[PDB]
Amino acid sequence: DLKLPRQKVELVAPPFVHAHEQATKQGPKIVEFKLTIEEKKVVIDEKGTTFQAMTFNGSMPGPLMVVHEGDYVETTLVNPATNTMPHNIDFHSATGALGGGALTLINPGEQVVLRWKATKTGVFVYHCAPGGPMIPWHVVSGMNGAVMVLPRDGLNDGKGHALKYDKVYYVGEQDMYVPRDEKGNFKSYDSPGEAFTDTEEMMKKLIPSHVVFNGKVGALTGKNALTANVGENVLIVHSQANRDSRPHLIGGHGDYVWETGKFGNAPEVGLETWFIRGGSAGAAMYKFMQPGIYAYVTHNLIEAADLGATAHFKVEGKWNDDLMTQVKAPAEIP
Amino acid sequence: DLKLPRQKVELVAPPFVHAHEQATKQGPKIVEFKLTIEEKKVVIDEKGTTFQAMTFNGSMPGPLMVVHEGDYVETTLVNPATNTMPHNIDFHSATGALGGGALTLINPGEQVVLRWKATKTGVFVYHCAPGGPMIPWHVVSGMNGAVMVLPRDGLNDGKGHALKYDKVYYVGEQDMYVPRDEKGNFKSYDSPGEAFTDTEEMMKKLIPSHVVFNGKVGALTGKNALTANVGENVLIVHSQANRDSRPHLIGGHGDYVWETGKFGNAPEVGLETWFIRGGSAGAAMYKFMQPGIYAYVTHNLIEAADLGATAHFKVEGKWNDDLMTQVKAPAEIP
Amino acid sequence: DLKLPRQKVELVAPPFVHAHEQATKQGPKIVEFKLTIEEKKVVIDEKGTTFQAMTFNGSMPGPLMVVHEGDYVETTLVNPATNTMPHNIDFHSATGALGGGALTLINPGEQVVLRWKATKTGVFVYHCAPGGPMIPWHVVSGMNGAVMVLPRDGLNDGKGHALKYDKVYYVGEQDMYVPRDEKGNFKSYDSPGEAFTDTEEMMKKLIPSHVVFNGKVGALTGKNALTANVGENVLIVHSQANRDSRPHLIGGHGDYVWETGKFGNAPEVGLETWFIRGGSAGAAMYKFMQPGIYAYVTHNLIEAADLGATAHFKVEGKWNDDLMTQVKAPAEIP
């Protein structure tokens, strides 16, 4: 019925994003994506705490999918027989059938193919949502990512000027609920099913044990710091499928920010901290002015420093003494 | 002194809203409303947990009051002798005297009549606020609702175009604090006064036991699902008098959203999830494009699925395969 | 190198703000400020609970610094030898070096001088951030304040009209974490270092024991109520360095509100409640229309009434019966 050109995308693991055009002369296409569910025990902190994760494509978050307004997104969702539970997918970008969830419930050993038209621009969450109490559990176990639906003319500032990024990163924040035993040590479990009772009891108390970017404390640090150069315009897409977050670039700003994440609305300018509503993605762009280390955090600083929610940028370039200078180094008080 | 026409309104129980005009050729009127306080033990979940509720007009939330900018709202507040506590009313829409609270404190057996001019457009909370520690307790016991103050020309998109809804629903979200005994079972109490000590101790820890729409788990489901048809523009007014919420229509969008709830500001467009600040009401409109079941949730999914904060819409009409289609049903992996 | 005129500012304790111009014919200057760190045990509630505070200039919050866009802000930070810990300062308004923190780490007995150019307009947090787990601890111990960077033409409504305030107040909200002993009584400690272990364990659970304005329950009440007169336009700057807040003026409104706090964006109009993201400052202006007592709260009413987060305004002037009137005083029900 639908006779449009087909284009396959090779998804890449976060925080990177598959290659795409911003402004495009292409017309609508059917863009084809594949997600393969993986349930797996992973390590989430530098002390070796383990977690029963459930993921799209083996990562937390799931990969960022990028399309343009009016494209048709055709996803093959695969639930291999090596998994234990049914799963599905719900796209906040899509219209009808609970975002697709009512059409994609698959048991281990099955796959399904869903197509939806990208009628709404912005960044959007996608997540598993099998039904009932399983919905929060699968999401907070890691089964969420995001999609970005660009205008065909690319981004603008609302005020007819184009806003072109040099690079884009996707920072998926995950609230995790790991129960503790009587000693006060984090518990380990042999299966997601076995983790369920204790994990649900903790979840209902609403306080996470960990809040992490890219699946683990320190994931986006050291060798895996985010990078930029002075003069580069970087777009940071930030999602949180269950709980609020308040992103902040320490030493920088959000030059243009869509905190509700939707490109039909003009961005706000010159923010210090912005707010990602639980169940949403937002986006912020910043042109780096200074070299050095920056930290990208949620600005609940307890969560950032003590629960895991800190990434770093390492930025190359020349220091600008007009913008900031140490007039007098630390010295004894006169 | 004030010589304007008087109009009586028959309030209706949420989620329905009393009949009103959007755009009107009427001039200012004195619009007359009556609220009768009822303290009552109610059931809040499908397991039979009870709660000592305090309500305006017998409902949680209290009913939605609808007027137009420049009307005078004249409320008779009635506290029958069958109640145990003093009560009052504070309207966020009103100016002076703590929103009216300083002029409406009434003991059991008394009534009072307050008039305020509707100078600010939008949706606003109203709530009881007797003084001191009683303020949070009365609010989280159920004593809150909302008022909607429409422009006389009706709603607009900010961009000179009219925005007319086919129907309006009021979803009042309530955070409830029910203490547990040593066993781990929810406690029942013989009076609001007897529930006070244990309830205050829990309240100060800031974690609700239940988060519900329209007073109970499952209230807006089954026979009491919200309804629409494909092609209908529905306005959903959402209030939360004490705690933040993040509304989301699963399978839909907020086509036009006033998340801070005030019609002097243009709506945002094409949202996935929006944010209702504790102590406020907001409003979102959506034109349904697909038939079927939708869930309307706060997108803290633990609260939605496990604590009570899910409503359903049942929508009639024709499925649109252009917008979404199951290209291949669940099948064994090749 | 930088040859501009120098101007010294005498900082004043919150909620007051040092004298400044709104619109100015001055060009860029180097504006000189001094902050002296003080670690001190203070009383935070009317029951006599004590707290190991860490402050800029002896106050919580630290004082508001006011400059204009394109000024250079030169701060001398002083850490006297009477303190026990290293400290630094990070300005969200500044660009590079973690907001200045990477250039201002000072041991007891040292001082440092930092200059930054005020390229971004709005209200911004400043806070200490020494590194690692110390970052949240120093902030929630009191080491935060705000700076306001005004346009040189003063404030505007976005719609070419000027917005001039008659007075400005700075309300700094502090979430505090005071542990309890087995009895259930709040603990007292002999030093910040001794309070650290118990305080960090509580902090990671994310629930404060107290939420206060200006450092203490009841600080901005009685003799220290905020004041205004009918007809006065008051700007209220509100900051929260770690945790969200939802300000509300009971009996009033936010006539013009920058809830993300940045003057490059037009204000929203006619709000009931606004939202300050943890790690940010915002600002709201209101022209008083009625005399009497107003309460300024966070509209989590449990926090406001039970945890400490209430200020009062006492307003002088003539009551306006058109806006609100008690039509019939409390009487027996007919």
Ligand SMILES: OC[C@H]1O[C@@](CO)(O[C@H]2O[C@H](CO)[C@@H](O)[C@H](O)[C@H]2O)[C@@H](O)[C@@H]1O
């Ligand atoms: O940035 C979106 C914002 O900008 C405005 C102009 O104020 O419209 C621009 O963006 C639209 C969506 O990309 C374009 O269709 C339009 O042509 C362009 O002017 C606003 O209408 C919009 O909210």
Ligand SMILES: OC[C@H]1O[C@@](CO)(O[C@H]2O[C@H](CO)[C@@H](O)[C@H](O)[C@H]2O)[C@@H](O)[C@@H]1O
């Ligand atoms: O939607 C409100 C938003 O729209 C604007 C136009 O951009 O003004 C419209 O709405 C006002 C309030 O209803 C009307 O008085 C006005 O005539 C109309 O253009 C904005 O000014 C406003 O913020």
Ligand SMILES: OC[C@H]1O[C@@](CO)(O[C@H]2O[C@H](CO)[C@@H](O)[C@H](O)[C@H]2O)[C@@H](O)[C@@H]1O
């Ligand atoms: O209030 C800021 C908001 O107003 C606009 C006009 O809609 O610009 C005004 O404010 C700018 C910043 O102060 C001035 O430079 C400009 O000249 C003035 O019109 C918007 O552009 C801005 O977002």
Ligand SMILES: O=N[O-]
């Ligand atoms: O599953 N580990 O690559």
Ligand SMILES: O=N[O-]
């Ligand atoms: O009070 N029950 O209808």
Ligand SMILES: O=N[O-]
């Ligand atoms: O330290 N007291 O003024």
Ligand SMILES: [Cu+2]
């Ligand atoms: Cu799943």
Ligand SMILES: [Cu+2]
């Ligand atoms: Cu969802």
Ligand SMILES: [Cu+2]
């Ligand atoms: Cu009451």
Ligand SMILES: [Cu+2]
């Ligand atoms: Cu209120």
Ligand SMILES: [Cu+2]
């Ligand atoms: Cu410090």
Ligand SMILES: [Cu+2]
């Ligand atoms: Cu900071």
